[PDB]
Write a protein that binds this ligand. Structure first.
Ligand SMILES: NC(=O)C1=CN([C@@H]2O[C@H](COP(=O)(O)OP(=O)(O)OC[C@H]3O[C@@H](n4cnc5c(N)ncnc54)[C@H](O)[C@@H]3O)[C@@H](O)[C@H]2O)C=CC1
Ligand SMILES: NC(=O)C1=CN([C@@H]2O[C@H](COP(=O)(O)OP(=O)(O)OC[C@H]3O[C@@H](n4cnc5c(N)ncnc54)[C@H](O)[C@@H]3O)[C@@H](O)[C@H]2O)C=CC1
Ligand SMILES: O=c1ccn([C@@H]2O[C@H](COP(=O)(O)OP(=O)(O)O[C@H]3OC[C@@H](O)[C@H](O)[C@H]3O)[C@@H](O)[C@H]2O)c(=O)[nH]1
Ligand SMILES: O=c1ccn([C@@H]2O[C@H](COP(=O)(O)OP(=O)(O)O[C@H]3OC[C@@H](O)[C@H](O)[C@H]3O)[C@@H](O)[C@H]2O)c(=O)[nH]1
Lengths: 459, 459, 129
């Protein structure tokens, strides 16, 4: 019966932007307009310097911008003439009220739903696409159900996004699965079927899963948690390794070869970050508490607690090696993004390690090859003026530093000329490898004269 | 240049038996003698009725018993003339003292190590092969180090077993990996190398991992924990599903298609059993406490707690549907083994569900197509005489039963003639599917007139 | 396991609150077969002090050498001067290996190398580990 010719996506961020760019590149006969309230963000999408760093994104966007892909601040007209409307906005964590610091704030999703009613007539498909959807489908539906025009027929779908930042293009093109939730009604099926059509342009039919909206959202919450759990589990083992002279990377390989366990996501680290994982577990915990499932609640909470412990442990290892005093000591922080190949800092372990060292009065010199320097400044908030310097390049940061702390797995960090760094560092020269990037360069670094300490090997 | 011609394995159980049988079948030029103190177990190994049920085991044993595979009670002479000695004995959980209910008792491992010293001269390789090795290598080594003859040279290796009961043959032949731990010394490497040689007869060289003994044992502890954790995680989700009208199997598929998560071991169930998992986690927890890592300890403990909760919940679901009273009510228990395709009941969720129902005064009629009936009796201990009947076949068990409770995923349970059962059950007729075996037969069973309740779903 | 010394200090027969009672009970909860020697504590007192579980695990030794015969470890709880004197080569020959001495009183200070030469694994309060 129905074919999607015009698509509108509200929210031009790390989800909405790339996911739409790819849709446009795969569906040249579809008009894709991505809208936002943030003007300078949209402007940047239209510039040759994109607002987010993501490998292969400049290439995908340029290939079809001004053709079938558009970025505009004109939300109203895009919703008005669109067949499908994506909601890909952020649901920040509530800072006050019940759920403070824990439950997600649906205020922006709601604002979108309202603004869609006000600007729509006829048939439209409204699809919620977030990285961690929390009761989102249901809250849109209740706004639509109450603000009913005649001849207005709005279908609500859930379509969670599985992309991982830094590899968004690769992931969007060859996704592991696509998950679409819709109502179990005649009208619901037709809307689901229509969205599959979009995806079927480049995704195999048996890689597309269709279900009801709630089962869809729950799947994503759980999926995210399982992922987060693996990192926390291996990090836990990393503490055990340091305590008993084993090596987590080795133990990891051995764990990983069980085809029932899989060998991905066992890379122990200073702790997981990003806007997905921590927020997702917290919401799952909160949900369980509200449903009167305290046993489940406290089970998943452990993922967060382990992660917190992982960070705090690594921090006090640095503070220890410096004889529990770092007042007016130059420390280099290499890497601020929550992972490699992005500029995103949301929830980066870097932020936390940094703050711990700041509470010790360390003079921090921070370098990251892609994170905007204003962003580093915002993230560490006064006390910032006295202690923080954003370095132009890594060598400035390490010049006269007592210690070098690696927090993000940027490939460029294996490359640095380490003899040069050692010459101009204060002795004893410490490298703290929170990412396991300097594995294999181990002897060399000791030969040069480094005292070299890494996560999950030899406390 | 060393070559292993004679092998002796102390312990002829679910580990030692099958793992040696397969060694003999793959290495026809090696003499493999499996010894035990239990006489009627050895006798049964030599009979046409083997002491343990395991698919394909009869075929493997018969093909090379008397030719190169021997089962004998004569421990002393087997040790005396062997090049390699396996220790594959049980380490039961301490019932008293520090570690009560938690830490493993190394008493039998020690008895073996002593008995080996007393019966050995020259060069021998001693290899510890257990399903969950706890400080086993180290304890053997301290006995050998102190009881030193001249010309006696005993090498200690760790070689954890990854097989899963019910698929031991398939697993032993195509293992995911083989893990060997030996000392990082000239003498150590030679012994490790010698053991690889045995395995290289049928296992690709790049599927064999070599390391130090401790790193090896820790790997197995961790690996086992990760496995157990998946089951508990999905089980936790199953409670969430039941509370919100989603379906865990569906959710599971969606989680499972993430190639980073893998799709194995997401089969929600009434709770994991067997002699590996619970015992492994407890020892890991205990080890962490002792190493002053409480944060890690309490992280892994959650796996056990969730599992306990999973069982308790399912139990009181049955008691609930029967209006909180089961005094003098006939309930059929289908399945008693901890999993399908074995006779083993060690830690079977069936034991626990059964006891919960016994404390309610239920008359239980238990059927399992492979569990010896004496074993069921031992496992439920007096109160047994008054309440328990071991049924000859499933239909006896369901005759006049208020409810049928499925605890083990035996394939034969989908086959049963369910109209027949429903005719002779008291109404309302309840089926409780703790294994998800009756998925797909859902309407049929409702048509027939069953009230059908299953894990991860709601009525 | 051999327990040498049961009196709460040397040169008395008094056991009231002796650390020996406590060490012994901890080792009993582990199911150790205890052979207890004290040159001045009435045998009956030892029996009262460890209270059934006593019958199965406790033996009051006539002299120290009986106690250490076939023992895995020797535990010294009371600073009786006579304990420095014992013929330790004799004890080690008839102990199960590895032979442990646990010096809870610091009486074997100075005899340290000798005991290691003989082949003991020797651990004491306040040293090493
Ligand atoms: N914002 C936060 O602090 C957090 C958000 N999350 C979640 O994780 C996922 C990440 O999504 P991103 O694309 O990375 O977020 P984002 O913040 O990078 O991009 C969202 C864009 O939506 C725009 N927007 C918000 N409300 C709007 C409205 N009412 N009308 C028009 N535009 C609007 C914002 O201005 C922003 O440019 C989200 O889908 C959300 O589920 C999780 C934790 C924290
Ligand atoms: N038995 C229990 O209750 C528990 C055992 N475990 C663990 O499960 C793992 C799997 O091993 P299985 O083959 O399933 O156990 P098993 O008990 O089925 O086989 C071990 C065999 O070793 C024999 N044996 C024991 N001590 C011996 C000795 N000192 N000398 C000679 N023979 C001796 C026993 O007679 C027994 O038949 C074990 O390696 C152990 O780590 C964990 C928790 C509980
Ligand atoms: O093995 C690992 C993997 C990841 N991490 C760290 O944990 C964080 C997780 O980042 P991811 O690589 O999972 O990617 P993202 O956080 O950008 O996206 C993640 O949530 C959004 C979902 O769409 C993706 O399915 C999920 O992977 C990063 O800091 C990463 O470096 C580890 O410390 N160890
Ligand atoms: O999805 C699952 C998988 C497994 N399980 C349960 O977990 C228990 C053990 O299952 P397994 O397949 O692991 O059988 P085992 O316990 O004998 O083997 C396990 O322990 C020993 C190790 O060598 C093996 O690698 C490990 O699989 C059973 O109760 C099984 O039903 C689930 O409940 N759900």
């Amino acid at each position: 019966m129905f074919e999607i010719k015009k698509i509108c996506c509200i929210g031009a961020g790390y989800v909405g932007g790339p996911t739409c760019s790819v849709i446009a590149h795969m569906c040249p006969e579809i008009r894709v307009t991505v809208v936002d309230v943030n003007e300078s963000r949209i402007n940047a999408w239209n510039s040759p310097t994109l607002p987010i760093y993501e490998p292969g994104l400049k290439e995908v966007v340029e290939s079809c911008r001004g053709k079938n892909l558009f970025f505009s601040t004109n939300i109203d007209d895009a919703i008005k003439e669109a067949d499908l409307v994506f909601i890909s906005v952020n649901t920040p964590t509530k800072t006050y009220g019940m759920g403070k610091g824990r439950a997600a704030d649906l205020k922006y999703i709601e604002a979108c739903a309202r603004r869609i009613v006000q600007n729509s007539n006829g048939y439209k498909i409204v699809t919620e696409k977030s990285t961690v959807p929390v009761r989102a489908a249901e809250s849109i539906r209740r706004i639509f159900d109450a603000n009913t025009k005649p001849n207005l027929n709005l279908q609500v779908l859930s379509n969670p996004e599985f992309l991982a930042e830094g590899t968004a293009i690769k992931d969007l093109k060859n996704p592991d699965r696509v998950l679409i939730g819709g109502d179990e009604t005649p009208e619901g099926q037709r809307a689901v079927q229509a969205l599959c059509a979009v995806y079927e342009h480049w995704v195999p039919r048996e890689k597309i899963l269709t279900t009801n909206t709630w089962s869809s959202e729950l799947s994503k919450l759980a999926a995210n948690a399982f992922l987060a759990q693996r990192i926390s589990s291996i990090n836990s083992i990393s503490a055990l390794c340091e305590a008993t002279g084993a090596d987590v990377e080795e133990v990891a390989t051995a764990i990983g070869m069980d085809q029932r366990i899989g060998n991905k996501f066992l890379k122990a680290s200073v702790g997981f970050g990003g806007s997905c994982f921590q927020k997702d577990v917290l919401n799952l915990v909160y949900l369980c508490e509200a449903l009167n499932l305290p046993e489940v609640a406290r089970y998943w909470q452990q993922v967060i607690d382990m992660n917190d412990y992982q960070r705090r442990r690594f921090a006090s290892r640095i503070i220890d090696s410096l004889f529990n005093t770092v007042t007016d000591k130059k420390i280099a922080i290499l890497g601020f993004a929550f992972k490699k190949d992005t500029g995103d800092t949301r929830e980066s372990s870097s932020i936390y390690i940094s703050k711990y060292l700041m509470d010790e009065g360390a003079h921090l010199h921070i370098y990251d090859p892609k994170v905007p320097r204003e962003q580093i400044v915002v993230d560490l908030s006064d006390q910032v003026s006295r202690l923080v310097t954003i370095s132009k390049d890594p060598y400035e940061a390490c010049d006269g530093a007592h210690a070098v702390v690696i927090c993000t797995e940027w490939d460029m960090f294996k490359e640095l000329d380490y003899e040069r760094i050692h010459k101009k560092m204060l002795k004893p020269a410490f490298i703290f490898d929170g990412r396991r990037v300097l594995d294999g360069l181990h002897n060399e670094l000791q030969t040069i004269g480094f005292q070299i300490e890494t996560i999950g090997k030899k406390v």
